[PDB]
Amino acid sequence: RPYTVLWADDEIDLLKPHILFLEQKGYQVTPVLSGNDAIEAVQNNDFDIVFLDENMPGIGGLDALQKIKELKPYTPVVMITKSEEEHIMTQAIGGKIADYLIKPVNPNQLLLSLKKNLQQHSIISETTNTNYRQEFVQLGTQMSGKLSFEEWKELYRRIVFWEIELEQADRQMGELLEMQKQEANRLFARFVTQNYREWIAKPDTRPTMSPDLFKQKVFPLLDNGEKVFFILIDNFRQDQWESVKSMLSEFYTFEEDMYLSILPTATQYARNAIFSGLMPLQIEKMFPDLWVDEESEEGKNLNEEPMIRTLIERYRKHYSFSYNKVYETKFGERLLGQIRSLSQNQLNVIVLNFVDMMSHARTDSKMIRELASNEAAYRSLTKSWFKHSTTYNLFRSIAEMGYKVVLTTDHGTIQVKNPVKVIGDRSTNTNLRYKIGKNLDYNPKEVFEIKDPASVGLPHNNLSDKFIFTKEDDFFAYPNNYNYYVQYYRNTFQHGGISLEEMLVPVITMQPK
Amino acid sequence: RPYTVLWADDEIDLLKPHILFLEQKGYQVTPVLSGNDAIEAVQNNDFDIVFLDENMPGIGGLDALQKIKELKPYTPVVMITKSEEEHIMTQAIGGKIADYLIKPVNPNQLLLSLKKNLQQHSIISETTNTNYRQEFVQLGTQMSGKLSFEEWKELYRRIVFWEIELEQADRQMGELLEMQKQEANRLFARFVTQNYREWIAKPDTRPTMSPDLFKQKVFPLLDNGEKVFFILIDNFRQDQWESVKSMLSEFYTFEEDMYLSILPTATQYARNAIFSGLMPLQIEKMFPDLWKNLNEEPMIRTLIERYRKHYSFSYNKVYETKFGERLLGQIRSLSQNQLNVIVLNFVDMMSHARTDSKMIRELASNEAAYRSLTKSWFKHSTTYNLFRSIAEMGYKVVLTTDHGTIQVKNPVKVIGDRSTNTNLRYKIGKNLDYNPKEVFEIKDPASVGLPHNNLSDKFIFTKEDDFFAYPNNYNYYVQYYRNTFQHGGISLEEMLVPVITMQPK
Ligand code: BEF
Ligand code: BEF
Ligand code: BEF
Ligand code: BEF
Ligand SMILES: [Cl-]
Ligand SMILES: [Mg+2]
Ligand SMILES: [Mg+2]
Ligand SMILES: [Mg+2]
Ligand SMILES: [Mg+2]
Ligand SMILES: [Mg+2]
Ligand SMILES: [Zn+2]
Ligand SMILES: [Zn+2]
16 A cells, blocks of 8 residues: 655645655655645545645644644654744644654655654564574674673673564564573573682682672772762663663663672572672671571561671771662652752662562562563563652652762573472572572482582571572472472573573663763 | 764765854764764763764765664664665664755754754653643633533543643643543533433433443444454553554554443443443343353343344453463454454452552552553553454454543542442442442432342442542551552543544554
């Protein structure tokens, strides 16, 4: 079918050449001479696009625009006018013009506007598909052999880019990308299992990990005289950063990086290591009062403010600081109210827990299983949360306050698929990606077993002597109710183990505009 | 802060007059000579906008575009080029350019591009805020006096328009709109309570209501030889329709209307009325085993036969993702039927589960959030692809709902017995004790087509955005339910609901 163009201009005879050109390109043009005729035509037809003059006897083009946009908000309107007046331009933009062309007009400029306003999505979709096919082999090479840490960061960033871009592209491309990501996770699990014990043993040569994060990314700003908000969104994957960065770009410029969470990729271990600057085992040894056992009923992350204080002292720094923890926008609304009273501190730490709650809810909440059924829906829901919770205005307020922001997380999460059998663990019956126990029964081939937890900076109970971790998108399952257990947890989001999504996480340094 | 412009052109010397024009208007222009220089400049700075030539010694501008969009996806890029080749246009569009200007360029056209691409949101917001203030008095007049049903539809449509337009704009203006809406709902409750009984008693002259919907909106299409999908989205109000229609407009043209749900504005009553063509009193009589929506296909069958028609039809209900993906995979097999009825469930918003309840408080705390969630569900559930596939089958689509929901605000006291129903907007009981001035009171359910067991059974309905609260733990339940989304009562949102006739493009 040919696209239809309604063209209102009182001097349409002067546009004959351009109409002929459009008709030769395959467009059907209906010309009218006034804004009232244009309104009537839009009322009784479904034109694909409207071209409007501004200065016409009768109602002006800007008045016609308003009425047309009321009738057919979804139809593009292009203003084609001789006026060079800035206030006309501004009122056209404000009336939701799709484009604005000052006369005289090159007919090819009209063709550009038609392609862009009527076929942008299918043109971008085809170009994406072409570009992915032309890079598919390069990506497979990019993840081959042995990669440096910096190469893993680039690779994972490129895979996430394609995951998002291929939402808007041919499905078969999705299947190809899924399989490439599957391979990347298999290779990354290898990379981690081969080096992990040595990363903990040799702190000087290891990539930035949870206990290094404040020293590497926060202290240098503070020591250079900058005021910093450290915003920890629990359970925030790289692809969620990518989904919210466009919104934040209105208020901040970015320095984007990633770092490695320790194992287990879980709050009790990684987030306390962030805020203490220590491996969990060093927290227990140096500050036994701050470390809560895994078997305890006491909350595991209630000593982060004392931990931060010890970390600041340990490095002989004297920074003033605050610490606030948020679970609901409502207490988040309180914090937003009192946010400017934090302007006295060099360092203001905010923990947002809602995304972690939402993520766990993908297991037991029917609403969340529908709203985050897959990873594209998860990202979309993350964007809606960010925008319509107090988070958006928190970031906007902080920017007005002139603070730099360090936006990061303690770990990500991964959608799990295939079960791994296990038995006999203690106090880890809740977690599906790592277990702690003594006489654990499992297949050593299917996990990463730590038989010496003290070698990788982990404490434990006397009743437990080992950790085991799942890799890739496996999840632990018990035999006694295996088949219900497998059906219930398949395709849920889980953290604690080894994967790109869980361990390779964003840390963004942001400067207000 | 000054807006910064990166401008890559091998002939930037010839563009000195344009640079000067822009610098006089406050723009800071950095000129570079090549695509590689432009990439490096973008990599090491934070320009607000990039102006890019196509044909330059070294890499092509289309190559620079791709890399710049990779580094800074949120930065707009305007192609300024002597090229008029269609394939260059297409590649630029496909590379996500913001604008494409063919040389020679009027410097005022550059200015237009800078305003549109850097200040559009703030320009639209101020225009909306100004335009709302200019209409404020006229809108108050529009809802004054005695409004016909058609005038109620136009007023509600205009209020919803301003509600959505104003969410991208001044917060105080939206608060004024909220008050106007509250006054509209007060006046609409009066319109309903004054007319409700007469409407049910007079099918030949009443506005279109639940039991009339098929007769009024579906059968005339089928009698005209058209084939129809009747898609009913549970609990989908007018502002939710307005939130998803731009997505649908890629595939359909629209004839938009609204109709009135019966009371209670709840699925067991309104949706069974739709599919049977009867009031619930008669439904319960004739389909006791289906009286609470388990299979409605027999109802639809009896409705068709009652009107002496012979339509082939299917009936399908999608509760969750699993079965929506199935239906989508087999959707063309429904081509054998003249009438295909699909029921889609939106997310349950009255779930008392602890988790579901916590999710709602964060994710749907206000109406803008509720609309955003609807758009996300529509796009990433199978719903969007369903509508897309049906459009390829050449069917007319009637898209509708059985009732809406309203965000409740203030409590209304009621005392009932232990068997009293749980709904926050309507109550049924023999022992109900309430202030009659605060509710719409139906002392005899049978006289407005509602079933009941006891002579002393009554229905009472909240109006506006009230909700019922029992005395026991009144303070706890008032805090717990305030600002939740509920249905069953009398409001524009719950009762005046969309029915859209769509034709595939
Ligand atoms: F008269 Be139109 F504005 F060129
Ligand atoms: F509470 Be954390 F996400 F393990
Ligand atoms: F050399 Be540019 F394309 F005008
Ligand atoms: F099922 Be409906 F939302 F009452
Ligand atoms: Cl070990
Ligand atoms: Mg004119
Ligand atoms: Mg005029
Ligand atoms: Mg050139
Ligand atoms: Mg070149
Ligand atoms: Mg009675
Ligand atoms: Zn965590
Ligand atoms: Zn968690």
